[PDB]
RNA sequence: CUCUAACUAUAAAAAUCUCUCUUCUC
RNA sequence: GGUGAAAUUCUUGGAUUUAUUGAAGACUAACUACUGCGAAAGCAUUUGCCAAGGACGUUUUCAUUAAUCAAGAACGAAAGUUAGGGGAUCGAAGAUGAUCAGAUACCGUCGUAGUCUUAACCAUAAACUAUGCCGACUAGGGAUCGGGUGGUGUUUUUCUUAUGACCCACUCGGCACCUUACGAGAAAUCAAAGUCUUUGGGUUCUGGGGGGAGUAUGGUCGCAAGGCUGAAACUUAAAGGAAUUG
């Protein structure tokens, strides 16, 4: 069923746009952290584009 | 026409393989096409633990459960439930019955 | 038939017959 | 896939694929000169060696039999070349 | 260690007319082997849990004549080379002797498994019911 | 992946390098490597363990990239050649151990089989030796010239 | 209940009032040395019952000995020796496990190793004794299977032999007891053996006593007081 | 974006079957 | 006891169980898997000896020695036949007690030859993957077994390196598997049963409708059982394959 209350509210909140775009380095530690080949991915591709490198400890648990 | 793509005996570069006796017509079978089951159960019923939990000796006992495999002629297999007869397309499926109870 | 069983009897009709061959000698 | 340069394979996956499957059928062997930690003289031992290498200037075995390359003897220092 | 004497009952438990019989601990001494068939008159029931528990009230009322107040259980199947699997009553039996003022104690299985011989009965294609 | 007698089809080799010449690090002499070789034979080296053992100890890759010619070549031309290949004496060799260890206990079967294989290379070897005439057009190996040619 | 043919081919008494109890009592290896009561058919000379019960054997399991529950898989038998009147004295004669702790170690998707060997005491007692191995899972393994090479398996063998053989040869079937109840020979086998593979629940088994040299009454009384 | 625990327990006996087989073109 | 229910059968000379022992021959449980070895049959306690083989590694050795192969040969499940040895289990024959109209069948008990061996015959099996062997190419995915590769890898542990066991990315070979058709097939299906009308890599052996019939006869091997070889007269419009709906 769809009466055009129900499309009214879906739109209205679906319009909505949050602020801030929830990455904006803003959260989290201002500068994100990642791991060494990304960052040196955008070295190779010549972007300033600031960074924070880390290591990832590539060993798996049982899992 | 073959029945089964893996022949329905999952032998498959072995030539030979040693028979074992049915376990209830004790019909003598290949050791693959010898379908199996374990029946791992409590020595006691869950039905009767509360009687033997309040009324003995040695508080906290172990209450131990058997061990024993079950190896079926595929007679007795399909006749005491133990296997079904699928479906065409379902005959590919070998997943056990999706983990009983999880 | 069981082609089984018909090879079974045409062999005793051959046991048969062979010994009569022998018992003709 | 579907166009390649079978001329030009990247180095990497060259070495990557097997032995007389590249564009030229190469050794993946080599020559290591070996010194033993008592004599400073300079013996050449094949990777792959087989016997039990034995240096003639003394009885100080470096490298013993073994499936793949000769295990060397824990005191003795290699060069490749 | 309130001086539990001890016993050991011994069911023996087949698809067909299961067995209950207390002894000493080394075994030696019996104790109402009375068993299964002793009190049904079918003949066919004799593996039912109801013969279960009749043979099992019975020994344990011998038992507390006799003295003893303990028992550990061994439970044993027809096994050897027959189905290796505890009769249908004989769990019964066990029911009704934990329930008859008897203390249990250490419960075990003993039934005779094989290394693999003596050709199980039957033939090839085995029983054809 | 051929092994006439195993349905293996393994590829079990080696790949020898592309430059025909000797490798420009190497500091030895092809008269001393010739010299070594003749040595070495003298002992009683089989070619293979010859070259093997100059592969392992010293810079001699392939003797022929070094002294310009072959191992057993060289023996035949210094006169070290042994009057029957390598290859087939080790066949030999290995029969004669195999029909050793048969008439010692009987039931072996697989043995027996195993010995039938072998006379078969056996015999083609000596086959294709007697076309290219290294052996005498008379020789033959059945059993007992064969226990003579063990010794 | 009837049914019968009764194919025979009524001086009824009493025959539990016309018999006497015993005590058992086990070595000074265990912590409780008691170990219960025993019927027997009353001493009459001509058929003393001291007589009967030289011999009689007993099925013990070694928590009640101990009163630990973690020895309650294992089960120790002791033989009837010296009688001294209402209570009687027993010696070692075998252990062993429940049978229901070796099945549930015995589980699929990795191999077991046995080994098997006959072994004489430091004394006389003349033993065989078994033991048995199961792989471990490692600490990070996805492999989904744990299974051992043959040659990893006859070095494994070969290992618990040489240190059964060992442990046996040095004491006295009393000091061996003493050894088996802390299972340290357990700990040995893996201490020798987590180089080769991990091998857990290594445990020794039906410790069978097969000869016994006369009778040795005075390390018996040493064992019981 | 953190996981691998439950389980039961049946079979006695039932053999045979006379016809009559007939189109698709708008 | 034994069964769907029962009987035959053993049992107060005490059968059934309850313990210790001991004898015999048997097999090697559970570990046991879409895992391994072998040419195939087949192979499963431990240890030593005997010889053998695959695969992998190899800047080692010879230089066409290669593939399949009429003729010829070796192995060749079980049953069978000789003879000698053993003789537990289980069971053709027979003996039985049931079921039924009959049941000398299926269920139930005993029991001969065999089942296990030691030398010799037998050489057939749905000896099936109902796919001959050797080659080259063609599509995605994983694991798994054997070897060998590289890790600034992990725990290992002997402080630390060394091993071993694992994790990763491999690679070579093996049993296989999953997905798919863009190839085939008549389809069921096949990663070969593809690269076959756009018809040619090298090679052996088989079939030409079904019955008659693997029968007749002659050879040939075998003591025998029988095996290999192998028709015709004649009789029919079908038999057969795969799938579809009832
Ligand atoms: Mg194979
Ligand atoms: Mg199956
Ligand atoms: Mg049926
Ligand atoms: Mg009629
Ligand atoms: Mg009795
Ligand atoms: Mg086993
Ligand atoms: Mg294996
Ligand atoms: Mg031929
Ligand atoms: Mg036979
Ligand atoms: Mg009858
Ligand atoms: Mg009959
Ligand atoms: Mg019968
Ligand atoms: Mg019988
Ligand atoms: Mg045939
Ligand atoms: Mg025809
Ligand atoms: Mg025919
Ligand atoms: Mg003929
Ligand atoms: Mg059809
Ligand atoms: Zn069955
Ligand atoms: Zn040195």
């Not at chain 1, 009466?3 to 739109?11: A, C, I, P, T, V």
Request: charged letters at 30%.
């Amino acid at each position: 069923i769809s009466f055009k209350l129900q499309e009214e509210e879906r739109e209205r909140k679906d319009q909505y746009v949050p602020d801030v775009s929830a990455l904006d380095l803003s959260h989290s530690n201002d500068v994100l952290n990642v791991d060494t080949q990304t960052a040196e991915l955008v070295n190779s591709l010549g972007l300033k584009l600031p960074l924070s490198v880390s290591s990832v400890s590539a060993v798996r648990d049982r899992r | 026409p073959k029945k089964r793509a893996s022949n329905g005996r999952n032998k498959k570069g072995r030539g030979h393989v040693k028979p074992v006796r049915c376990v209830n017509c004790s019909r003598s079978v290949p050791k693959d096409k010898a379908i199996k089951r374990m029946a791992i159960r409590n020595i006691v019923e869950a039905a009767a633990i509360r009687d033997l939990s309040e009324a003995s000796v040695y508080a906290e006992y172990a209450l131990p459960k058997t061990y024993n495999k079950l190896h079926y002629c595929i007679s007795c297999a399909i006749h005491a439930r133990i296997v079904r007869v699928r479906s065409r397309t379902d005959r590919r499926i070998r997943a056990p019955p999706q983990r009983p109870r999880f | 038939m069981r082609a089984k069983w018909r090879k079974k009897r045409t062999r005793r009709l051959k046991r048969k017959r062979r010994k009569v061959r022998a018992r003709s000698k | 896939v579907l166009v390649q340069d079978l001329l030009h394979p990247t180095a990497a996956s060259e070495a990557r694929k097997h032995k007389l499957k590249t564009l030229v059928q190469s050794p993946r062997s080599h020559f290591l000169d070996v010194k033993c930690p008592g004599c400073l003289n300079i013996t050449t031992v094949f990777s792959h060696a087989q016997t039990a290498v034995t240096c003639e200037s003394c009885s100080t075995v470096l490298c013993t039999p073994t499936g793949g390359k000769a295990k060397l003897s824990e005191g003795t220092s290699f060069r490749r070349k | 260690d309130n001086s539990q004497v001890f016993g050991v009952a011994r069911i023996f438990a087949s698809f067909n007319d299961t067995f209950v019989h207390v002894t000493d601990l080394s075994g030696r001494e019996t104790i109402a082997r009375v068993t299964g068939g002793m009190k049904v008159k079918a003949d066919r029931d004799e593996s039912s849990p109801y013969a279960a528990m009749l043979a099992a009230q019975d020994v344990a009322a011998k038992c507390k004549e006799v003295g003893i107040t303990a028992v550990h259980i061994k439970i044993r199947a027809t096994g050897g080379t027959r189905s290796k699997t505890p009769g249908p009553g004989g769990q019964a039996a066990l029911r009704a002797l934990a329930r008859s003022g008897l203390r249990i104690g250490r419960i075990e299985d003993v039934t005779p498994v094989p290394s693999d011989s003596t050709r199980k009965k039957g033939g090839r294609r085995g029983r054809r019911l | 992946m051929g092994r006439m007698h195993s349905k293996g089809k393994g590829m079990s080799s080696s790949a020898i390098p592309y430059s025909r010449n000797a490798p420009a690090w190497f500091k030895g002499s092809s008269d001393g490597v010739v010299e070594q070789i003749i040595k070495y034979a003298r002992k009683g080296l089989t070619p293979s363990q010859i070259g093997v053992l100059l592969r392992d100890a010293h810079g001699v890759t392939q003797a022929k990239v070094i002294t310009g010619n072959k191992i057993l070549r060289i023996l035949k031309s210094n006169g070290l050649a042994p009057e029957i290949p390598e290859d087939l004496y080790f066949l030999i060799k290995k029969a004669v151990s195999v029909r050793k260890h048969l008439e010692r206990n009987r039931k072996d079967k697989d043995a027996k089989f195993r010995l039938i294989l072998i006379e078969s290379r056996i015999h083609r070897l000596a086959r294709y030796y007697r076309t290219v005439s290294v052996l005498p057009p008379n020789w033959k190996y059945e059993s007992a010239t064969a226990s003579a040619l063990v010794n | 209940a009837v049914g019968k043919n009764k194919r025979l081919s009524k001086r009824v008494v009493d025959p539990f009032t016309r018999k006497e109890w015993y005590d058992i009592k086990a070595p000074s290896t265990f912590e409780n040395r008691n170990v219960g009561k025993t019927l027997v058919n009353k001493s009459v000379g001509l058929k003393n019952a001291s007589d009967s019960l030289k011999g009689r054997v007993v099925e013990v399991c070694l928590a009640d000995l101990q009163g630990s529950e973690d020895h309650s898989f294992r089960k120790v038998k002791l033989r009837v020796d010296e009688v001294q009147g209402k209570n009687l004295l027993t010696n070692f004669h075998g252990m062993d496990f429940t049978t229901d702790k070796l099945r549930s170690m015995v589980r699929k998707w990795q191999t077991l190793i046995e080994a098997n060997v006959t072994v004489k005491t430091s004394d006389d007692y003349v033993l065989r004794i078994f033991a048995i191995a199961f792989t471990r899972k490692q600490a990070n393994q996805v492999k989904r299977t744990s299974y051992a090479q043959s040659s990893h398996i006859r070095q494994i063998r070969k290992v618990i032999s040489e240190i059964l053989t060992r442990e046996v040869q040095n004491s006295t079937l009393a000091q061996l007891t003493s050894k088996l109840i802390p299972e340290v020979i357990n700990k040995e086998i893996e201490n020798a053996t987590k180089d080769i593979f991990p091998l857990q629940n290594v445990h020794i088994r039906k410790v069978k006593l097969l000869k016994q040299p006369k009778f040795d009454l005075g390390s018996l009384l040493s064992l019981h007081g």
